[PDB]
Design a protein around this ligand. Sequence first.
Ligand code: CL
Ligand code: CL
Lengths: 319, 319, 317, 318
Amino acid sequence: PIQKAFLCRRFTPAIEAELRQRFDLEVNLEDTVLTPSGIASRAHGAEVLFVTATEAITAEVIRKLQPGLKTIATLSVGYDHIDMAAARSLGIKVLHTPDVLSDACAEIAMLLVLNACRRGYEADRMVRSGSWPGWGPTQLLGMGLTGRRLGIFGMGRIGRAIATRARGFGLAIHYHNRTRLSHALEEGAIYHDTLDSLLGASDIFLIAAPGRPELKGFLDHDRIAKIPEGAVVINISRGDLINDDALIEALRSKHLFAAGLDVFANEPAIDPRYRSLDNIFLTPHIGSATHETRDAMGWLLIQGIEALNQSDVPDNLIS
Amino acid sequence: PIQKAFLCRRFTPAIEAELRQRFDLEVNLEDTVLTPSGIASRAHGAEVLFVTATEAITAEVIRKLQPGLKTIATLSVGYDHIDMAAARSLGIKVLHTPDVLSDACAEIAMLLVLNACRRGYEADRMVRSGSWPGWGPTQLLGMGLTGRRLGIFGMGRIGRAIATRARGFGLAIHYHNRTRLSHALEEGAIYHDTLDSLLGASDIFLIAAPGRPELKGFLDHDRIAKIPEGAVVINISRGDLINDDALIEALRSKHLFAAGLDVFANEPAIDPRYRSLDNIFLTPHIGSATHETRDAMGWLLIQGIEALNQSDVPDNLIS
Amino acid sequence: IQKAFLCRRFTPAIEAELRQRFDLEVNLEDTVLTPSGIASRAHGAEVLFVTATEAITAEVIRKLQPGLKTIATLSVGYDHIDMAAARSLGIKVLHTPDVLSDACAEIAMLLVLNACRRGYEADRMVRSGSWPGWGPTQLLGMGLTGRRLGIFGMGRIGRAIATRARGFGLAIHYHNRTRLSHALEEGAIYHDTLDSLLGASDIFLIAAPGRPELKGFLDHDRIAKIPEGAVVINISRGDLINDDALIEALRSKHLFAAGLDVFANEPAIDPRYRSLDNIFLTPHIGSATHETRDAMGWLLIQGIEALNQSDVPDNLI
Amino acid sequence: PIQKAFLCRRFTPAIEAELRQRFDLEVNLEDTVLTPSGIASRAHGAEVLFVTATEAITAEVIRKLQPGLKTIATLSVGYDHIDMAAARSLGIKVLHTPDVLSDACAEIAMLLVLNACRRGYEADRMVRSGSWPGWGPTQLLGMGLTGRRLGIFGMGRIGRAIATRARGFGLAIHYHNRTRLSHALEEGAIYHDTLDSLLGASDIFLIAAPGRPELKGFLDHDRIAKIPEGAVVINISRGDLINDDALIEALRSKHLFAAGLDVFANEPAIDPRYRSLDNIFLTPHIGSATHETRDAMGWLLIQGIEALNQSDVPDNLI
Ligand SMILES: [Cl-]
Ligand SMILES: [Cl-]
């Protein structure tokens, strides 16, 4: 029998066309970010809830949607936006999108590394300005990557994809995680026992840590001051891990050469000051935004639900 | 004895400090491009003339700088801008700076590849303009690198540095040179006997081939048509290799998904349509623009002059 | 896929791109349609192609509901569309900024050269068959070399005019509300007031876009501040000039000549202008090159394509 | 006591005032072009003859004006209209006006380029017509100068001043002269060792080559056919360099988009068809017509005579 589903954010048109045939589908047409009250209200009666990282699926949402709601399907690798304790207490099946976005995310990480080190914003702005004076020996001199140290805080699956790409540029890989990785995954990277030690060895300091309450605002005035003068900071994980005041102060003082951010505290209501910095490159949270990756994400949800409909265990089920 | 030198364009402060130590140095402080008449008047009396590819060193310049002028040292790989027939006839020694640009140039090639494929221009523009509505599943979908073919026209030292960096992103390397490379240098890239064969196999088509009269405007309507639909074109060699009309036309039909350019026909007076294309990233001929590479070039000249001063034959002496 | 309606003929080049991309219906006769004509003829279209000559009122927007989703105007400005009405309905509005400077600067120099060197009298004389032949005192004009060009509102269009003027040996003066960076000045002489600019202008040129504050600003008192024998050029908006004042000064010879591409109440211009020998007149053709009109069209095409893939183009109002 | 002088064409009032003060001056008040017999009739007795290019100073004229005539002063760069061998054989001093016209002439060339490319004639006619319907998206579209190639035939002093002004509009400069200019004078301009080569690469083809007999009618049917379709032709040098039949035909056939002409074969009796072409802008040989240029030319003649009166050797002596 055809399940009722509610779709909280607009997905790619190919995936939407499949969902319309596969479910009795109701769609959040204007693509707004619904509040938990909004979700509970709009989705009442749905058996399957299609969500993303922008939807706060709280314990209250999950309860209010009973007895209808059986499945939460999130178009994201992360799932901390879903109250998993509530979901599992009620036998709710939760699906996510593992092992399909690390290549795309690593591409954006490297785009930011390159744009920060080699001054991509100023570069493209200059050509389009109509005032480029032509080639000059001192025109937009950047930092070469060869021989420098890329320090990765939270070198998980996405972090390791970044390191693979980074090694090709002659970057020495340094990292800090709670636990040292095996040799197979480390691939020579230098393990630092503490964040302080990592910060002090990073010519480019990159945040790839998934992000946890304990990590909110961790990159602050004291910690930035520990990074060598002339370094670059990159963030591809979650914006609230960075103290915006601390970062913007360090960019203006030039203790940091430059930055590259794909994520921002309070996005899209990002700190207005970022937009007038010449030594930053900004990307609108497009880590996983390739045609192939976003389609693969949608298909993992569809395939997972097919598996639930046949009483099989989905590969992408979160316990 | 202590030689008078004239510097026609500013070099890095590090290199200028070395030159002041070794020469009675006069500098073109404002970093303007001196006309041949201006070079002759400003540099009169210099024994060593420090130049770049932006200085037109004509027969008349070399003659007007007699009898003082003995050495021209150019901060460039090429020496087309120096009348070598005149320099030979006056017994002038000419030095240049080959074979130290590959890492920096390869970083810019990858910067262009990533920004073209993942929409760096539209990304930064959107965030900076305050118009970003927030993360969404269909926002700025780009082309992933994994499972795609990078086709390199002219895979010499710079080309191979690009292939090294490209492999980390999961790009399969294809290339066309007149002659096939040795097994050692190939590292498994696929050789194409003809430029036509390479074009047809290129998801990303990259020009790293040095410019030649015969290659001027080779990338034209017919050759772009041979590239698979949805491809990306990158140019880091020289602008006049591309037919601007053909490139722009294909960026609009979407036969080409995007482009990345560091060099342009008639630079710095580039085609005025480029800046209005959303599917392009542009850099102002900054391929070799790292402190490390510009310093390395300066050191090749310094070492060359010291060799000449001892009556040695430097390896960077042009015949 | 999308239904579009085109209200005025565009270049054959752009119309071909539009037919390729849209189920396109065109106003073939190219007659300026009325708000009710538009609402009638456009019925069913998702995309509406317009120019500054189409009054896109609230009722046009409402009558084309529910099909109309996008208004694309071939113009920098958007006064002619009811933005409040569009905003309340979620309608996307696209315009074509920042691609007109080269073409407009060409018309500015055309007007400068024709006014100073008497192009109107020149062509009329040859064409009328009354030219007696070359003579050392025939149609003497004012050379540009060593003279001062004063540009009011020197933005992207102004700076493009300045680049071209420099080659003729004109010294550049300007007035903007805020001074430009030293690099963008290129040695131009800054005047912190308009009155100071007027006083130093051998050729006075209006490029300033023009708010309602500047309406009628070039009047009797301000023209009097310009050095006797000067030339006035206007390429911005007609109503910035007081016609009585300009005509009086052209007749008195306080001003040598003038060149105008724009006019108060156009195309119903002051009928006295056509009878002045010391003026050159162009019919608002500032941006009239194939390359520029096509460039504007491409901004719209690009904007719509971005909206279709759910992205936000830079030319969305 | 002071010199008798005859002035064959009206000069500017500032120059005539000065001439009446320095000479016993007789003037062709009517400003007609005097024939060789008319010049001999009017100027008899003159010691100084003030002329322009419109005066045919033949051997016959010079002998009829003997023994008085000892100085001929021409308000012009060229002196083709003066029989120099006749002048030399009688010890007659000739003065001309070199090197002061290029800026004024370059302005008219640019006026012509702009009016032709941007449809100045049609434009001004439309406004004055009373039937201008108002701004339209396809109203009087012309060709932008940015990125186009300006091809100059005979890039001399005048041609180089044109190139200076044209570079500002984003025009690429191409040229063909008999001999290639030095790198310093080229300033990057592209040299074609043949006219054919130049013609084939000119989006705007401009004639700045000073007139010589070899070149009469050079721009004909075959040569215009070599210019790319949709190009503009400009002439500020000499009218008889262009075959009028060829140019008019190519303008009507629209092989050429437009032309700008300051000079014309048989001027002032120009080909009547030119007047009915909408894709032409016409100027009545006003290349050098500014107050400053015409005054400067006049002062060169005056100063040169002053120098001869002091037994000194004037720069402008031929
Ligand atoms: Cl503009
Ligand atoms: Cl003058």
